[PDB]
Each structure stands twice: as structure tokens, then as C-alpha cells.
């Protein structure tokens, strides 16, 4: 079903920057299904190509995050039974970075999750993309 890595860009920055805005532009809308918050239900998803996790802050477990963001054939659940995944981009947006999602006491290691992120875009003071490897990230990704 999916055989490719889900691409997972994070958008960070304070409430009313334009996280929502940045996520609705990147693809059409035919395209982006948006992950009801605070629940493990992909309910209305669709196998749109392009998924986005609004105001994230870590409620979905580790693992279960780590699997969305990787490149097997996977099924997620819905009220009415799993569907299959299908998302080739997935958007993350928060007011924290990741740093701030889950504790390293929480979790095997946090660089899984790093590693598996793409791409990071950052509000400044515009959006700016960010080269992990920085002063808002010390982690690598990708």
C-alpha cells in the first residue's frame, strides 16, 4: 500500500502565525486530509497524500508516531474499522518544537523520532526553514 518514506515536515511557532495557513497552501485541499486533534481516530481519512497533525504536542504515542512517519505498508484506526495509510507528506504543526513533545525519561531514544522528521520551518520574529543541526534543534534529522 505505502511502499515510500512519509515525508514529515514540522511548522513551529506561536498561535496565529499562520501554522494552519502554511499547512492549507501546501498541497491542494483534495489532497490534505487534516488528523481530528487529541484522538488515535483517523476517522474521514481518504488516502490523501497529504496529512496534517494540527497543534500537535505529543498525544499520540511514541511508537505510534514513529510508524506514521516511516515508509511500510501500515493501516491506522478508525470508529468503523482500519484503513489503509497512504500519506507521502505528512505536516506537523505546534507551538513547541519536538524537543518538547516527549521526554527522553518517556521514550527508548528521541533520536527515532528525529531522524525520521524532514524538514523544519520556524516562525521568526516569516516562516524560515531551519537546518537541523541548530540553536531552536540541536538534534539531527532526516
Known amino acids: ?23 492549507a497552501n501546501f498541497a491542494d485541499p483534495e489532497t490534505t486530509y487534516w488528523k481530528p486533534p487529541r484522538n488515535k481516530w ?11 497533525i494540527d497543534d500537535f504536542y ?9 510508524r506514521l512517519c516511516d515508509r511500510y505498508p501500515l493501516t491506522v484506526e478508525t470508529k468503523g474499522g482500519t484503513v489503509p495509510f497512504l500519506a507521502r507528506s505528512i ?9 518538547e513533545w516527549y521526554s527522553s525519561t518517556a521514550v527508548p531514544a528521541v533520536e527515532a523520532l528525529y531522524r525520521r522528521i524532514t524538514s523544519l520551518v520556524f516562525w521568526k520574529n516569516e516562516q524560515s526553514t531551519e537546518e537541523g543541526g541548530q540553536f ?5 534529522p532526516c
Not at 500500500?1 to 499547512?23: E, F
Not at 505529543?58 to 514513529?66: K, Q, S
Not at 531552536?136 to 539531527?140: A, E, G, I, Q, W
Request: hydrophobic share 40%.
Open 1 to 23: 500500500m505505502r511502499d515510500w518514506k512519509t515525508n514529515v515536515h514540522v511548522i513551529v511557532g506561536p498561535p496565529g502565525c499562520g501554522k494552519s495557513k502554511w499547512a
Open 42 to 52: 483517523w476517522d474521514g481519512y481518504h488516502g490523501e497524500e497529504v496529512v496534517v
Open 58 to 66: 505529543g498525544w499520540l504515542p511514541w511508537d505510534d508516531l514513529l
Open 91 to 99: 505536516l506537523i504543526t505546534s507551538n513547541q518544537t519536538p524537543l
Open 136 to 140: 531552536v534543534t540541536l538534534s539531527p
